[PDB]
Amino acid sequence: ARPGGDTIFGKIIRKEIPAKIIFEDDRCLAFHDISPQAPTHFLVIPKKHISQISVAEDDDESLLGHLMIVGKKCAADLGLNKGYRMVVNEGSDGGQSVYHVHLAVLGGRQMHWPPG
Amino acid sequence: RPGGDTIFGKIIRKEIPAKIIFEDDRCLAFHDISPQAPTHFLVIPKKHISQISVAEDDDESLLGHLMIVGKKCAADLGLNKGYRMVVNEGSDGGQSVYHVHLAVLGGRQMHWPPG
Protein backbone atom coordinates (compact mmCIF):
# COMPACT_ATOMS: atom_id res chain seq x y z
CA ALA A 1 0.00 0.00 0.00
CA ARG A 2 3.01 2.30 -0.66
CA PRO A 3 3.36 2.35 -4.52
CA GLY A 4 5.86 5.28 -4.56
CA GLY A 5 8.27 3.83 -1.94
CA ASP A 6 7.18 6.96 -0.04
CA THR A 7 5.42 7.37 3.33
CA ILE A 8 2.99 9.65 5.15
CA PHE A 9 6.11 11.24 6.68
CA GLY A 10 7.28 12.23 3.20
CA LYS A 11 3.94 14.00 2.64
CA ILE A 12 4.41 15.77 5.98
CA ILE A 13 7.93 16.89 4.99
CA ARG A 14 6.57 18.13 1.64
CA LYS A 15 3.77 20.00 3.49
CA GLU A 16 1.24 18.09 1.37
CA ILE A 17 -0.73 17.26 4.50
CA PRO A 18 -0.91 19.24 7.78
CA ALA A 19 0.97 18.29 10.89
CA LYS A 20 1.55 19.93 14.24
CA ILE A 21 5.11 21.01 13.45
CA ILE A 22 7.30 21.91 16.46
CA PHE A 23 10.55 22.67 14.64
CA GLU A 24 12.20 22.42 11.23
CA ASP A 25 15.71 22.93 9.84
CA ASP A 26 17.44 21.88 6.58
CA ARG A 27 17.77 18.20 7.51
CA CYS A 28 15.03 17.28 9.96
CA LEU A 29 11.46 17.93 11.07
CA ALA A 30 9.89 17.64 14.53
CA PHE A 31 6.13 17.28 14.99
CA HIS A 32 3.57 16.01 17.47
CA ASP A 33 2.52 12.38 17.11
CA ILE A 34 -1.07 12.17 15.85
CA SER A 35 -1.68 9.20 18.21
CA PRO A 36 -0.08 10.46 21.46
CA GLN A 37 0.73 7.92 24.21
CA ALA A 38 1.86 10.53 26.75
CA PRO A 39 0.91 14.18 27.52
CA THR A 40 3.92 15.12 25.37
CA HIS A 41 4.66 12.84 22.43
CA PHE A 42 6.47 13.99 19.33
CA LEU A 43 8.64 12.71 16.46
CA VAL A 44 11.93 13.95 15.01
CA ILE A 45 12.46 12.62 11.49
CA PRO A 46 15.28 13.12 8.94
CA LYS A 47 14.25 14.74 5.68
CA LYS A 48 16.44 12.05 4.08
CA HIS A 49 14.27 8.97 3.46
CA ILE A 50 16.06 6.37 5.55
CA SER A 51 13.48 3.59 5.76
CA GLN A 52 14.78 2.02 9.01
CA ILE A 53 17.74 2.40 11.36
CA SER A 54 18.93 -1.09 10.33
CA VAL A 55 19.86 0.26 6.84
CA ALA A 56 21.32 3.60 7.97
CA GLU A 57 24.85 4.14 6.64
CA ASP A 58 27.90 5.16 8.68
CA ASP A 59 27.83 8.54 6.87
CA ASP A 60 24.32 9.15 8.36
CA GLU A 61 25.82 9.11 11.84
CA SER A 62 25.87 12.85 12.54
CA LEU A 63 22.36 13.18 11.01
CA LEU A 64 21.09 10.53 13.48
CA GLY A 65 22.72 12.32 16.41
CA HIS A 66 21.15 15.55 15.06
CA LEU A 67 17.72 13.98 15.53
CA MET A 68 18.59 13.35 19.20
CA ILE A 69 19.96 16.87 19.79
CA VAL A 70 16.92 18.38 18.12
CA GLY A 71 14.80 16.01 20.24
CA LYS A 72 16.24 17.15 23.55
CA LYS A 73 15.99 20.81 22.47
CA CYS A 74 12.34 20.40 21.51
CA ALA A 75 11.68 18.56 24.79
CA ALA A 76 13.03 21.53 26.75
CA ASP A 77 10.88 23.97 24.76
CA LEU A 78 7.74 21.84 25.25
CA GLY A 79 8.18 22.19 29.01
CA LEU A 80 9.61 18.73 29.84
CA ASN A 81 11.53 19.31 33.06
CA LYS A 82 11.07 15.97 34.85
CA GLY A 83 12.32 13.79 32.01
CA TYR A 84 11.34 11.82 28.93
CA ARG A 85 12.04 8.74 26.84
CA MET A 86 13.46 8.67 23.33
CA VAL A 87 12.61 5.63 21.23
CA VAL A 88 13.58 4.26 17.84
CA ASN A 89 11.54 1.31 16.63
CA GLU A 90 13.03 -1.14 14.11
CA GLY A 91 10.94 -3.65 12.20
CA SER A 92 8.07 -5.88 13.22
CA ASP A 93 9.30 -6.83 16.71
CA GLY A 94 10.27 -3.19 17.40
CA GLY A 95 6.73 -2.12 16.52
CA GLN A 96 7.88 0.23 13.75
CA SER A 97 4.73 1.90 12.35
CA VAL A 98 6.20 3.90 9.44
CA TYR A 99 9.15 2.83 7.23
CA HIS A 100 10.83 6.22 7.54
CA VAL A 101 13.25 6.53 10.45
CA HIS A 102 11.81 8.48 13.38
CA LEU A 103 12.91 9.26 16.93
CA ALA A 104 9.92 9.40 19.28
CA VAL A 105 10.10 11.49 22.43
CA LEU A 106 7.55 10.80 25.19
CA GLY A 107 7.09 12.62 28.47
CA GLY A 108 4.73 14.50 30.78
CA ARG A 109 4.05 11.25 32.72
CA GLN A 110 6.05 8.51 34.44
CA MET A 111 7.38 6.18 31.77
CA HIS A 112 7.48 2.56 32.92
CA TRP A 113 9.86 -0.37 32.64
CA PRO A 114 10.07 -2.44 30.56
CA PRO A 115 9.66 0.02 27.61
CA GLY A 116 7.12 -2.23 25.89
CA ARG B 1 38.51 10.43 35.48
CA PRO B 2 38.10 8.76 32.00
CA GLY B 3 34.55 7.43 31.79
CA GLY B 4 33.14 9.40 34.77
CA ASP B 5 32.17 8.42 38.31
CA THR B 6 29.18 6.07 37.64
CA ILE B 7 28.94 2.26 37.39
CA PHE B 8 29.29 2.84 33.62
CA GLY B 9 32.67 4.53 34.23
CA LYS B 10 33.82 1.39 36.08
CA ILE B 11 32.72 -0.69 33.10
CA ILE B 12 34.53 1.62 30.64
CA ARG B 13 37.70 1.39 32.74
CA LYS B 14 37.30 -2.42 32.90
CA GLU B 15 37.21 -2.25 36.71
CA ILE B 16 34.07 -4.41 36.70
CA PRO B 17 33.38 -7.07 34.05
CA ALA B 18 30.64 -6.91 31.44
CA LYS B 19 29.79 -9.11 28.47
CA ILE B 20 31.08 -6.70 25.87
CA ILE B 21 29.67 -6.95 22.34
CA PHE B 22 31.70 -4.12 20.81
CA GLU B 23 34.24 -1.47 21.75
CA ASP B 24 36.02 1.39 19.97
CA ASP B 25 37.62 4.69 21.01
CA ARG B 26 34.21 6.44 21.42
CA CYS B 27 31.83 3.88 22.90
CA LEU B 28 31.17 0.47 24.42
CA ALA B 29 28.26 -1.97 23.93
CA PHE B 30 27.45 -4.67 26.49
CA HIS B 31 24.64 -6.93 27.69
CA ASP B 32 22.21 -5.69 30.36
CA ILE B 33 22.29 -7.96 33.44
CA SER B 34 18.55 -7.35 34.02
CA PRO B 35 17.27 -8.05 30.49
CA GLN B 36 13.65 -7.18 29.65
CA ALA B 37 13.80 -9.05 26.32
CA PRO B 38 15.69 -12.17 25.06
CA THR B 39 18.28 -9.73 23.74
CA HIS B 40 18.93 -6.58 25.76
CA PHE B 41 22.15 -4.54 25.62
CA LEU B 42 23.45 -0.99 26.23
CA VAL B 43 25.63 1.31 24.10
CA ILE B 44 27.40 3.93 26.22
CA PRO B 45 29.74 6.81 25.22
CA LYS B 46 33.18 6.72 26.83
CA LYS B 47 32.78 10.49 27.24
CA HIS B 48 30.80 11.09 30.45
CA ILE B 49 27.62 12.74 29.23
CA SER B 50 25.46 12.55 32.34
CA GLN B 51 22.07 13.09 30.59
CA ILE B 52 20.94 13.59 26.97
CA SER B 53 19.34 16.82 28.25
CA VAL B 54 22.81 18.37 28.82
CA ALA B 55 24.51 17.01 25.70
CA GLU B 56 26.30 19.75 23.74
CA ASP B 57 25.62 20.37 20.05
CA ASP B 58 29.19 19.09 19.44
CA ASP B 59 28.12 15.67 20.80
CA GLU B 60 25.91 15.03 17.83
CA SER B 61 28.14 12.69 15.84
CA LEU B 62 29.01 10.76 19.03
CA LEU B 63 25.27 10.26 19.74
CA GLY B 64 24.65 9.07 16.18
CA HIS B 65 27.64 6.74 16.63
CA LEU B 66 25.87 5.10 19.57
CA MET B 67 22.89 4.44 17.28
CA ILE B 68 25.03 3.07 14.40
CA VAL B 69 26.90 0.84 16.84
CA GLY B 70 23.52 -0.20 18.25
CA LYS B 71 22.10 -1.27 14.90
CA LYS B 72 25.34 -3.06 13.97
CA CYS B 73 25.38 -4.95 17.27
CA ALA B 74 21.70 -5.83 16.84
CA ALA B 75 22.46 -7.31 13.40
CA ASP B 76 25.40 -9.29 14.81
CA LEU B 77 23.28 -10.69 17.64
CA GLY B 78 20.79 -11.99 15.05
CA LEU B 79 17.90 -9.54 15.64
CA ASN B 80 16.59 -9.85 12.10
CA LYS B 81 12.90 -9.40 13.09
CA GLY B 82 13.45 -6.04 14.76
CA TYR B 83 14.26 -4.21 17.98
CA ARG B 84 13.68 -1.08 20.02
CA MET B 85 16.31 1.50 20.94
CA VAL B 86 15.60 3.59 24.03
CA VAL B 87 17.20 6.57 25.73
CA ASN B 88 15.97 7.35 29.22
CA GLU B 89 16.18 10.95 30.52
CA GLY B 90 15.56 11.89 34.15
CA SER B 91 12.98 10.68 36.63
CA ASP B 92 9.99 10.42 34.26
CA GLY B 93 12.20 8.66 31.67
CA GLY B 94 13.29 6.11 34.27
CA GLN B 95 16.99 7.02 34.12
CA SER B 96 18.84 5.34 37.02
CA VAL B 97 22.47 5.86 36.02
CA TYR B 98 23.53 9.46 35.28
CA HIS B 99 25.61 8.48 32.26
CA VAL B 100 23.71 8.46 28.99
CA HIS B 101 23.08 5.07 27.38
CA LEU B 102 21.16 3.73 24.38
CA ALA B 103 19.35 0.49 25.30
CA VAL B 104 18.55 -2.03 22.55
CA LEU B 105 15.84 -4.65 23.14
CA GLY B 106 14.73 -7.45 20.82
CA GLY B 107 14.00 -11.15 20.38
CA ARG B 108 10.30 -10.67 21.31
CA GLN B 109 7.34 -8.54 20.23
CA MET B 110 7.72 -5.11 21.83
CA HIS B 111 4.48 -3.41 22.83
CA TRP B 112 3.10 0.09 22.49
CA PRO B 113 3.32 2.43 24.28
CA PRO B 114 7.04 2.01 25.21
CA GLY B 115 6.29 2.27 28.93
Curated annotation (Swiss-Prot), chain A:
Gene Ontology MF terms in the entry: adenosine 5'-monophosphoramidase activity; deSUMOylase activity; hydrolase activity; nucleotide binding; protein kinase C binding
PANTHER family linked: HISTIDINE TRIAD HIT PROTEIN
Tissue: Widely expressed.
UniProt KW Transferase keyword: no
Result, substituting K47N: Loss of SUMO-specific isopeptidase activity
UniProt lineage: Eukaryota, Metazoa, Chordata, Craniata, Vertebrata
CDD domains: PKCI_related
Record: active site: H102 (tele-amp-histidine intermediate)
Impact when changing I34W: Approximately 30-fold increased affinity for tryptamine adenosine phosphoramidate
Residues recorded as bearing N6-acetyllysine in the entry: K11, K20
UniProt EC number: 3.9.1.-, 3.4.22.-
Family of the protein in this entry: Belongs to the HINT family.
Cystine bridges: none
Effect ascribed to mutating H41R: In NMAN; no mutant protein is detected due to post-translational degradation; no effect on SUMO-specific isopeptidase activity
Outcome of mutating R27P: In NMAN; negligible protein expression due to post-translational degradation; loss of homodimerization; significant decrease in adenosine 5'-monophosphoramidase activity; reduced SUMO-specific isopeptidase activity
Positions bearing Phosphoserine: S35, S62
UniProt keyword terms in alphabetical order: Acetylation, Apoptosis, Cytoplasm, Disease variant, Hydrolase, Neuropathy, Nucleotide-binding, Nucleus, Phosphoprotein, Protease, Thiol protease, Transcription, Transcription regulation, Ubl conjugation pathway
Consequence recorded when altering G95A: Reduces adenosine 5'-monophosphoramidase activity
Location relative to the cell: Cytoplasm; Nucleus
Name listed for the protein in its UniProt record: Adenosine 5'-monophosphoramidase HINT1
SUPFAM superfamilies recorded: HIT-like (SSF54197)
Subunit structure of this chain's protein: Homodimer. Interacts with CDK7. Interacts with RUVBL1 and RUVBL2 and is associated with the LEF1/TCF1-CTNNB1 complex and with a KAT5 histone acetyltransferase complex. Identified in a complex with MITF and CTNNB1. Interacts with CDC34 and RBX1, and is part of a SCF (SKP2-CUL1-F-box protein) E3 ubiquitin-protein ligase complex. Interacts with SUMO1, SUMO2 and RGS17. Interacts with the Ten-1 ICD form of TENM1. Interacts with CALM1; interaction increases in the presence of calcium ions.
InterPro entries: Histidine_triad_CS (IPR019808), Histidine_triad_HIT (IPR001310), HIT-like (IPR011146), HIT-like_sf (IPR036265)
Role of this protein: Exhibits adenosine 5'-monophosphoramidase activity, hydrolyzing purine nucleotide phosphoramidates with a single phosphate group such as adenosine 5'monophosphoramidate (AMP-NH2) to yield AMP and NH2. Hydrolyzes adenosine 5'monophosphomorpholidate (AMP-morpholidate) and guanosine 5'monophosphomorpholidate (GMP-morpholidate). Hydrolyzes lysyl-AMP (AMP-N-epsilon-(N-alpha-acetyl lysine methyl ester)) generated by lysine tRNA ligase, as well as Met-AMP, His-AMP and Asp-AMP, lysyl-GMP (GMP-N-epsilon-(N-alpha-acetyl lysine methyl ester)) and AMP-N-alanine methyl ester.
Swiss-Prot record, chain B:
Keywords assigned by UniProt, alphabetized: Acetylation, Apoptosis, Cytoplasm, Disease variant, Hydrolase, Neuropathy, Nucleotide-binding, Nucleus, Phosphoprotein, Protease, Thiol protease, Transcription, Transcription regulation, Ubl conjugation pathway
E.C. no: 3.9.1.-, 3.4.22.-
Chemical reaction(s) catalysed: adenosine 5'-phosphoramidate + H2O = AMP + NH4(+)
Effect of E23K: Reduced SUMO-specific isopeptidase activity
Reported tissue expression: Widely expressed.
Gene Ontology CC terms, in alphabetical order: cytoplasm; cytoskeleton; cytosol; extracellular exosome; histone deacetylase complex; nucleoplasm; nucleus; plasma membrane
Source organism superkingdom: Eukaryota
Residues modified to N6-acetyllysine: K10, K19
Residues annotated as binding AMP: D32, I33, N88, G94, Q95, S96, H101, L102, A103
Cellular localisation: Cytoplasm; Nucleus
Resulting phenotype, C27R: No effect on SUMO-specific isopeptidase activity
Presence of the UniProt keyword DNA repair in the record: no
Gene Ontology annotations of biological process type: intrinsic apoptotic signaling pathway by p53 class mediator; positive regulation of calcium-mediated signaling; protein desumoylation; proteolysis; purine ribonucleotide catabolic process; regulation of DNA-templated transcription; signal transduction
Gene Ontology terms, MF aspect: adenosine 5'-monophosphoramidase activity; deSUMOylase activity; hydrolase activity; nucleotide binding; protein kinase C binding
Domain HIT: 7-115
Effect after changing H99A: No significant effect on affinity for 3-indolepropionic acyl-adenylate and tryptamine adenosine phosphoramidate monoester
Residue window of motif Histidine triad motif: 99-103
Annotated active site: H101
Phosphoserine found at: S34, S61
Related illness: Neuromyotonia and axonal neuropathy, autosomal recessive: An autosomal recessive neurologic disorder characterized by onset in the first or second decade of a peripheral axonal neuropathy predominantly affecting motor more than sensory nerves. The axonal neuropathy is reminiscent of Charcot-Marie-Tooth disease type 2 and distal hereditary motor neuropathy. Individuals with NMAN also have delayed muscle relaxation and action myotonia associated with neuromyotonic discharges on needle EMG resulting from hyperexcitability of the peripheral nerves.
Role this protein plays: Exhibits adenosine 5'-monophosphoramidase activity, hydrolyzing purine nucleotide phosphoramidates with a single phosphate group such as adenosine 5'monophosphoramidate (AMP-NH2) to yield AMP and NH2. Hydrolyzes adenosine 5'monophosphomorpholidate (AMP-morpholidate) and guanosine 5'monophosphomorpholidate (GMP-morpholidate). Hydrolyzes lysyl-AMP (AMP-N-epsilon-(N-alpha-acetyl lysine methyl ester)) generated by lysine tRNA ligase, as well as Met-AMP, His-AMP and Asp-AMP, lysyl-GMP (GMP-N-epsilon-(N-alpha-acetyl lysine methyl ester)) and AMP-N-alanine methyl ester.
Protein family per UniProt: Belongs to the HINT family.
Protein name: Adenosine 5'-monophosphoramidase HINT1
Organism: Homo sapiens (Human)
